[PDB]
């Protein structure tokens, strides 16, 4: 079921490079748009991924980028997914031409929050939630991408909490100090993502290094309010950053809060 015949693919344009190498845009059976990850040799724990691919193909939600299948009878193996015409959320936010209204920004947060509440319902962690790992389709809908894939990355610079690629700025204190990953580390990262959205893609803690950020966070300092966020929006993002993990909300609660502010604003 998971298995796609690579002969059914027509490759058309390069989309860029990520943690597992090049990704292309193409067509499946002459007709259907798809993105195709061509997994770089040595970048991925391929046999582990392939077993997990079966669980991932049952994750289906309108705000999650859909996995369509894998091509495994070969090397490089390919991962085939839904295509998102406007690319990564971070770069979309940084394009000032969009002149976003705050109602649009809140809708992006709600899109992600729906996807994350679905994952939480399935006890599945993203592990690398950030605007760089959300994608935007041709209707301006945001969807969460590459959830779970951090587990198969072979690169020590990405996996170590002191690596140059580790997502320090998206991590709660208990992840930085003890590697304690949970639903509540996704919640923390979601707060940082809302902050990214409302800051139009500024880097979190933009004047600090990763090392200084970790120390700031441990002393209890936080990101402060983006100019575009109302007080009510800021309360929601700030709630994700409680020092104590069990005092942070769930994605179900966060969704309820976002819907309430949409109605008020
Ligand atoms: C001027 N611009 C040039 C670029 N244009 C433009 C650009 C991309 C698109 N669409 C898509 C891009 C992509 C994509 C393309 C390249 C790299 C990546 N990436 C990015 C990050 C990451 C992170 C991980 C972490 C979890 C371990 C794993 C990973 F595997 C990755 C990965 O693979 C991704 C996202 O999966 C995926 N889909 C599914 C698209 O649909 N559409 C228009 C926009 C206009």
Swiss-Prot record:
Lineage: Eukaryota, Metazoa, Chordata, Craniata, Vertebrata
Residues reported to bind dasatinib: 81-84
Entry text on domains: The PH domain mediates the binding to inositol polyphosphate and phosphoinositides, leading to its targeting to the plasma membrane. It is extended in the BTK kinase family by a region designated the TH (Tec homology) domain, which consists of about 80 residues preceding the SH3 domain.
Residue(s) carrying Phosphotyrosine: 158, 224
Phosphoserine sites (modified residues): 211, 230
Variant or mutagenesis effect after changing residue 15 to P: In XLA; moderate
Annotated protein name in UniProt: Tyrosine-protein kinase BTK
Family: Belongs to the protein kinase superfamily. Tyr protein kinase family. TEC subfamily.
Disease: X-linked agammaglobulinemia: Humoral immunodeficiency disease which results in developmental defects in the maturation pathway of B-cells. Affected boys have normal levels of pre-B-cells in their bone marrow but virtually no circulating mature B-lymphocytes. This results in a lack of immunoglobulins of all classes and leads to recurrent bacterial infections like otitis, conjunctivitis, dermatitis, sinusitis in the first few years of life, or even some patients present overwhelming sepsis or meningitis, resulting in death in a few hours. Growth hormone deficiency, isolated, 3, with agammaglobulinemia: An X-linked recessive disorder characterized by growth hormone deficiency, short stature, delayed bone age, agammaglobulinemia with markedly reduced numbers of B cells, and good response to treatment with growth hormone.
Full-sequence range covered: 394 to 658 of 659
Effect of residue 149 to P: In XLA; growth hormone deficiency
PTM section of the record: Following B-cell receptor (BCR) engagement, translocates to the plasma membrane where it gets phosphorylated at Tyr-158 by LYN and SYK.
Outcome when changing residue 158 to F: Loss of phosphorylation of GTF2I
